[PDB]
Symmetry: D2
């Protein structure tokens, strides 16, 4: 227990009375709306999203990095910090690892995870930066590099990530690369994509039959003119070409300005290629900000498509959920805590949508009532449900409040002198 159980209990009891009042009030309101609050809480308690190992330490921009106190010094420290997020929110039982950033003895990583009550989600490969002793540089690409030996090196790296994942219980490999060009003419769009497809086919050949392979598209950065896997269209072509175990991963901040992202989600679901999500928020580019902190309605609309898929009777749909954020000006743990909370908030609200009423307004082309039907769910303050879900499962009514009351940051600051 990273956070003392007496502190969690103390801070829960301090807020118990108010929560009971709010939960009962919301329960009565939902009952008048024909909704059983217990049914919603039950589902919310089971919604999990993976926390990124790279999100526990302070992040930075190309201009600078401003570390806070008690910065995790490596993957083991990061797991310790991830354990706090899970203990308090109970929404992040699994951690996403990144190789080679998190290279360490796989057996030990698993042992630490087991002891902390943490599992492992999809592995993440890294061929967008060079490691010491690397024979070929990824400056001009990796899986799509013009040099055969460089592509082979990239493929081998991904296979190594799979081996590490098999040792810790991971069941998927997420591949995001920076491959692209900064100048017109630098790359031949088609040949580069053909090279990428051939290299990914080699990774697919080495992909276990109990694993999934996720490709992540991105409009730009680090490539500023063209990117090989630039959007969901190219991503679909990739997944379809590689095989049934290959699917598309949608990172919210990787789309062109004003893109209707929830529609992309719906399209990928319809064609069975929505592998998972990388949650975060943004306003300008791939800002990697706390989920829902900028555009909470958009997050709700994405979850509205996920819940509709269930309502439509879609089968075999269990998308992977992961947070992909960098925290440059906040306590990383607090941001991950509230981000995970925001994701459950949007999910809970999506569950409140009166699907029967919405379907009726859609068929009758009553646009105003259709949108108001979504708003009635979205406007509902589901915090009491999120808090009760946490309380009932060993977490904290007010996660960040308990975190601060525990003095954890000051504790690790003292344990991790810099």
């Amino acid at each position: 227990f990273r956070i003392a159980q007496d502190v969690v209990a103390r801070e829960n009891d301090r807020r118990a009375s108010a929560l009971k009042e709010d939960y009962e009030a919301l329960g009565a309101n939902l009952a008048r709306r024909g909704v059983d609050i217990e049914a919603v809480t039950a589902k919310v308690e089971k919604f999990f999203v993976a926390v990124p190992s790279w999100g526990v330490g302070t992040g930075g921009t190309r201009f600078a990095r401003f570390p806070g106190t008690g910065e995790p010094r490596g993957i083991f420290d990061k797991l310790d910090d991830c354990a706090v997020i899970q203990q308090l929110t109970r929404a992040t039982p699994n951690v996403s690892l990144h190789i080679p950033w998190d290279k360490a003895d796989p057996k030990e990583l698993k042992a630490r995870g087991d002891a902390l009550g943490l599992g492992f989600d999809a592995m993440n490969s890294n061929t967008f930066s060079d490691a010491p002793g690397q024979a070929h540089s990824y400056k001009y690409g990796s899986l799509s590099h013009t040099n055969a030996a460089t592509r082979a090196q990239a493929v081998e790296h991904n296979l190594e990530c799979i081996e590490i994942g098999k040792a810790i219980g991971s069941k998927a490999l997420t591949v995001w690369i920076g491959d692209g060009s900064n100048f017109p003419g630098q790359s031949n769009f088609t040949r580069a994509f053909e090279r990428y497809l051939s290299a990914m086919a080699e990774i697919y050949k080495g992909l276990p039959d109990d694993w999934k392979l996720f490709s992540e598209h991105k409009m730009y950065e680090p490539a500023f003119y063209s990117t090989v896997v630039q959007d969901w269209g190219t991503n679909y072509l990739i997944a379809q070409t590689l095989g049934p175990k290959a699917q598309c991963l949608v990172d919210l901040g990787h789309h062109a300005p004003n893109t209707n992202i929830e529609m992309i989600v719906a399209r990928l679901i319809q064609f069975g290629k929505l592998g998972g999500f990388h949650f975060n928020d943004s306003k300008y580019g791939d800002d990697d900000l706390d989920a829902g902190a900028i555009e909470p309605y958009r997050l709700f609309l994405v979850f509205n498509e996920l819940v509709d898929a269930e309502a439509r009777g879609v089968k075999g749909f269990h998308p992977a959920h992961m947070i992909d954020q960098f925290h440059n000006v906040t306590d990383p743990i607090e941001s991950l805590i509230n981000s995970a909370n925001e994701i459950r908030r949007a999910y809970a609200q999506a569950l409140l949508v009166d699907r029967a009423a919405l379907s009726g307004y859609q068929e009758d082309n009553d646009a105003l009532m259709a949108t108001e039907t979504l708003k009635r769910a979205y406007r509902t303050d589901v915090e009491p449900i999120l808090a009760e879900a946490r309380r009932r499962t060993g977490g904290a009514v007010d996660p960040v409040a308990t975190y601060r009351a525990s003095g954890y940051r000051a504790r690790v600051a003292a344990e991790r002198p810099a």
Copy 2:
């Protein structure tokens, strides 16, 4: 001839000396670069782009329309004006018709086109607006409308367009609809797309053996929250689902801000689904401005992909080329003339690219020289090639100058009554 031949001859003669000097100079410059100017001229003279019947009349915005003089009323007046563009540029032998705007007896349409030296490109259906006496409104959609009878009406309309096209020599149907939603929840994205795919399959069944069906994606407008055929990804799904006769049409101004459009073109070519283009330029949204007037390099980069596809003999590559613009503050004929010119300009420059050198710099990851290889072609003023191509084929050395010298606008202004 819409424009008197003696006027064309006269306006060519007064500009012939300068063209001779510039063509010979460009010829020597290209010769020093290992390029045969005549070879480029040969390709340029065979590049054609269809002119839109809806482009010769003055366009407008939702705020207002400011018509000019001699506004063409009806397809017959429009064809007469399109004929001027072809006569002077020799780059627009075919016209794109839009139904019901251009509805007229098929035999009469074909007869008029033949007399004017004009052919007909892809037909364009219209289920994004309501025509008088229409049984079902398209306010909430057409091919993807929730009402079965409304979808059937839209399908029937498209089949009618195919019948008209068959009668006049067309070999394709372009389908662009406004279908979408203005509010979250208004439409179920998936169900709407399912309805669209089912309706399009019916249209597909009515396609002759040698016809193509082009679906045109658009991010937004008239729908301001979601659009069924919103981007090339959805467009690809449509084409692949419908069959080999179905391909994607790319309209330059229909993409999100900063989109790499030339890459979309490359992707569609690789998978054999680049049905064609709707050329125009833009800066903010689907502005429908004169091609190349805002971002000429982007137009060149699109053509770089087109010329590259040819260079490597890509299978199934044969996109249709069409101009889709609205002229709100210029003489429509002049804008179409210069737009067709800009399109041939970008094509000619793409032809100048040293493909062998480019491939070398790409393989060696010499980004600077690779981009400079494209720039050497793009920086070349190919106007002499475009002008000489026109001069040798019955066109005008300076199309707009000849147009103005002819007094054509004043002529039709006298034959056509304005509102006031």
Copy 3:
């Protein structure tokens, strides 16, 4: 009464029990947070936003217009419909007129307004389209047209708008023009702006002592390459150049993609040039959609800046609030009703922000708690407050439901002839 009182009464009674339960529960929650729900409701019931006359009829795009039934015949029918919105929401007592669309005898306009319990907000001029009989066309511009005679014609039109406004009770003139270019080189940016400044200076000379002149910026449309009054920077230069009576109007959908609009609002307030707002929502361009239907948080963030101005004690701050929307696929009256509701919703939430706590988190650079302080207010479902405000002021607990129960649309559909040409 456009809507029968017995219908409003019956529909309010039908929902009285639920409103009581929700309002009281919210009241208890707010109290635990140190907020007096009564204080919030009292301010909410006093928040007004002007309804656009051009928003009562169905709108359209450059591709098509799909009118509904009972479209207004003219301004008088539009005022009658605005009376419905005000009766039910009690948040829209004033109407924004547009000349020449709403041109009519000022005495008659005032008479109808008074009879319906409606007032008039800022006048709106129209030199972005040609009216019959004009000696000069606005095709290539109006107030910034290269032709002096054309500029003079546009100036006189704006002065006429002021005269009409003075007669009906208006106290401001909003000037939005399409002036700009579609091609590089078509216009000399500086000279076009100078011409505009000269024309606006003339209009300024016609302003009564207690009037304001609002200039509205827009990035593009109808001009697709450059627009004279393209953004808030140019707008500020206009207001500062003209004088103390000249201020800037911010229309939410008139900014470049990803623009931080709430900051623009803050900047104009700081330099005393925030004249007012044109509320609406959008996702792509100037979509003119129902306020808050696309990005409700942004709307709240704009109001957060407005309320912060009061918190900072900004003297003499009385921004005009107006809705500027077009309803292409809904009953215009219903959209305006829910849009006014959404505006009061964002306002109410902004009032809930614990600014004492917020100021502390800002000082200590506690970004997470600072943003959570805003979210605690925004996440609060203030619908009970909006509904109670309506109940106590003669409005409807559920405006659209009551509107539908009244059968108003069918009624006017039988009284108003549809366009046949």
Copy 4:
């Protein structure tokens, strides 16, 4: 001479014949258009743009940095490399320094510059990152930080930059900060701006009489929700508030998608606040790519506004031209060479515009001919003018070709330590 004179001569002689043919042909073409090619070349030879010291080293993104061979060890190596750009293009006689990156003995800097034939443009302060031994962190801001002591430290740093600039010959200070917020509510927009204005007022008081203070706006990055100096409107307020010595700097890649940047330039000129430029190109965000490599017409349109002003001679009007780019996948020197060339290319084409004809088409509302009047100039290949300008001023006909023939990169690679690849960071 960084590049052997015999190499420059040899590589010019090799291309002299073709240049003569192209220059004479262009000369005849321009003569038919009523333009004297010599008058254009004369102006082009005098057009200068400052090179960024931070541009000669390989750049990086927040994801990774892939240095090449012969990376500069410090400011002295950087000046040596900048000397190559000036020798071959003759368009970059001045270098822009950044403190503390280029901190060194002022006398030594001045000495190296004088020896290389290089001068110094505007100084650039750095309060967007923390330096070793720094008392107060700029994590939450600098000039607009809530903490008074932090703002004071930032002000003092800027004054130090002025002192260094005075010693080496600089006549301006460019201030770009990352100050902003990543979350709604984190910052009070107004109070933050008030703090910024007050701090800048202190910096302004320390400005010499013949110096300029340039504030640089940026929509976002590093701040991802709000930025204090976010656009030209705020920038104008800053310049107008501070005084006549304060002007606005326009960096091309710092605007919202689809922004009409050339209009911003015109507006700033109209109100006398166009301090200068930071040239580069971009497609998505502040990409910092080689000028003109992505949107060459936009660069020409910006220069069209500059030449228009340079034509009707707004006097004393001398905006500071500077390149601000990062080169992540090319030889930094080659990119700066071609970028400077591209800037002169746009300038040259703008000089070809028939101003009288354009004015006429504008007054007559002949939109088509007005735009064609601009295109007639833009379509002209002015490379012969650029190459001849270089040839007769001591530069190279084909700069990059000569650079490669000289083997300079391989030369400095052998004179400098090898570099290691790593994570993000410019």
